[PDB]
Design a protein around this ligand. Sequence first.
Ligand SMILES: NC(=O)c1cn([C@@H](CO)CCc2ccccc2)cn1
Ligand SMILES: [Zn+2]
Length: 349
Amino acid sequence: TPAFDKPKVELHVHLDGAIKPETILYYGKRRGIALPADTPEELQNIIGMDKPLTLPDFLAKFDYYMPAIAGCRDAIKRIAYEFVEMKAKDGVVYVEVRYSPHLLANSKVEPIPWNQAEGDLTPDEVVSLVNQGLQEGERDFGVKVRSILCCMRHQPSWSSEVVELCKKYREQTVVAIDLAGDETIEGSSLFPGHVQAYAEAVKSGVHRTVHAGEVGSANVVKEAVDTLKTERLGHGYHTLEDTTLYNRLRQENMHFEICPWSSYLTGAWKPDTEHAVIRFKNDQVNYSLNTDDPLIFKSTLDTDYQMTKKDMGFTEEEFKRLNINAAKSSFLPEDEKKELLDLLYKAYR
Ligand SMILES: NC(=O)c1cn([C@@H](CO)CCc2ccccc2)cn1
Ligand SMILES: [Zn+2]
């Protein structure tokens, strides 16, 4: 049944949106937090979704569940180990996972997220507990794994902590910075907090990705390329509404992190119109296929590939192409990158 039963590479998936309902339950239960439901299966279809939603409704999902893990050392390391296990069963050989460390913290973080009380788990500790879970995961499951830390659009005052964290934990396992949250906040790409984080990133040799054009206008993409100096785009789909920027981004071979099932579920994509990934396929653009938030979308990687095979004509050949563009556009050291590419070229013939 899998649409593409071969190794893949995944560059766009959020750790906080890729937790096992069973673990949420565990810590919830064990901590007295208080879930909407008390068996694995019920939680899942409560946090899960199958229609487009408001934005408020989407964000509220992270309340149900986040307080159960945030602030808890055990569970922070556990989600990270368990993530890698999950990517094994989808057949991935290399994945970059991303998350905001402030958002699992309950100490030396203002405001404190999710209405937590103040404990003693810091953002910097959060990054080493995820590093541990990810590295012990890699060694047991056979997936090569790096991470990316996210600044958050609405909170530019965390962002220099972000980059400083990327440089502090670099290749152990953090290899890049991202910018995540509400891309429609006016001006948010240019808040000086985020600008100067991404200029430190250029000056320190940290890779950069940014979510832009998933639901913002193409001017948001243009700000991520020209001012934050991004190297890849999260989604990038409204890039098509600006012909000259589209044409220039194909020209320099910009990588687009595409997330098709997520894009229908969130509204980003209207069912009555060509999906932007078909335009990309036909134009030969550099893009990847990715899950975003498997927990919210009740998906695994094969969901994305079954959508595009089924409902869009995608062939094995295209599949192979796109994973090879992923590996080529990953944020690994060049020696490691070429090692990856060898693994896939061999598997693919
Ligand atoms: N799909 C997404 O946009 C997304 C964002 N996150 C995290 C960072 O990885 C933040 C989610 C969040 C929700 C509500 C308030 C603040 C942050 C996870 N998935
Ligand atoms: Zn995302």
